[PDB]
């Protein structure tokens, strides 16, 4: 109930480098209602062997990975374990997950500033799911709206920039409308020409 768990690999019997990777992916949908564990053994970039729990056994994927698999699949106790790592390793960490990562919200901070172009800048937010809208006089603009892709900061915070095209004039009032889980009610920021 206390620590996180992980997946466990197995013994299979211009400088140059040889790289080996092992990724123990879990895959979540509807909370803990759909969970798929994959287990990827990788030589350099070639995925060579895999245990995907929608499958129930090891499988090679390049010639290279075949002895590795043949052997493990024979070893009854390994399957035994690897079959139940989707409950031992995946659901577990999602429970500890539900109680930390998946409760942490961070209010984005909106800023509008000139290029004639006009940039609504939405900085520092988490989770990833955000919706940004522009408005020219309480009236949704969409044709001018050009966004950057979502920007992952990798300090657990995201940003996005969302540009709007406007040939300006007096009177005109432009407004950026941002909705995000951190928030009880949407943020709006206006810019006066």
């Amino acid at each position: 109930p206390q620590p996180e768990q992980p997946e466990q690999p197995f013994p299979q019997p211009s400088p140059e480098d040889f790289v080996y990777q092992f990724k123990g992916m879990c895959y979540f949908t509807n909370g803990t209602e759909r969970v798929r564990l994959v287990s990827r053994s990788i030589y350099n970039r070639e995925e060579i062997v895999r245990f995907d729990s929608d499958v129930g056994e090891f499988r090679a994927v390049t010639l290279l990975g075949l002895p590795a698999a043949e052997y493990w699949n024979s070893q009854k106790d390994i399957l035994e374990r690897k079959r139940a790592a989707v409950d031992r390793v995946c659901r577990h960490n999602y429970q500890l997950e539900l109680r930390t990562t998946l409760q942490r919200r961070v209010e984005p901070t909106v800023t509008i500033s000139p290029s004639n172009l006009l940039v609504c800048s939405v900085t520092d937010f988490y989770p990833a799911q955000i919706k940004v809208r522009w408005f020219r006089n309480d009236q949704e603009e969409t044709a001018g709206v050009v966004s950057t892709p979502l920007i992952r900061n990798g300090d657990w915070t995201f940003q996005i920039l969302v540009m709007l095209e406007m040939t300006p004039q007096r009177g005109d009032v432009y407004t950026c409308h941002v909705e995000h889980p951190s928030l009880q009610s949407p943020i709006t920021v206006e810019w006066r020409a």
Binding site: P6, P9, F10, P11, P15, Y20, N44, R45
Partner: protein, 184 residues
């Protein structure tokens, strides 16, 4: 090509000959939760949030990584020593927040498509290297089995100081300089 609400790697394990060096980390929705130091034998959390009710046995990492050594050597032989192909890295620098001359901010330098996981991301103030106020992420995994690393530099925007992300990596002929200025 897999759909899911959340993707976690409860086991990014990486071992390689050059060094030899390895790494162990856990990622969740594309963000690094912790990495395990492989000398100091210690879980190094990336949010103080996790250092509240949760730990993780750093021994488990070292066991995993020692196996990778075992299994790597085996596949080196088995492959007739097919070495890694040095790909070419995608590099950017941007600010963490809108920039106001005089008001403190952070430069984020994002070195992407890194392979193999060997790289020297350094910073540069007016062409003399800065080493203080820097800090980087570990290696972050991606689903085509390359990596990305992100270095950070806390700076005071002024119409006086100009910065360069010097990225050294075998895929390149010479070290890449991405360069950045504030607008005055």
């Amino acid at each position: 090509d897999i759909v899911a609400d959340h993707v976690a790697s409860y086991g990014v394990n990486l071992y390689q000959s050059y060094g030899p060096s390895g790494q162990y980390s856990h990622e969740f929705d594309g963000d690094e939760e912790f990495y395990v130091d492989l000398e100091r034998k210690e879980t190094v959390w990336q949010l103080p949030l996790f250092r509240r009710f949760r730990r993780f046995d750093p021994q488990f990492a070292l066991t995993n990584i020692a196996v990778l050594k075992h299994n790597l050597n085996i596949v080196i032989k088995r492959s007739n020593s097919t070495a890694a192909t040095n790909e070419v890295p995608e590099v950017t620098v941007f600010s963490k927040s809108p920039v106001t001359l005089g008001q403190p901010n952070t430069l984020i330098c994002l070195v992407d498509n890194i392979f193999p996981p060997v790289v020297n991301i350094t910073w540069l103030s007016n062409g003399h290297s800065v080493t203080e106020g820097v800090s980087e992420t570990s290696f972050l995994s991606k689903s085509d089995h390359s990596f990305f690393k992100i270095s950070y530099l806390t700076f005071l925007p002024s119409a006086d100081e100009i910065y360069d992300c010097k990225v050294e990596h075998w895929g390149l002929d010479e070290p890449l300089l991405k360069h950045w200025e504030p607008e005055i």
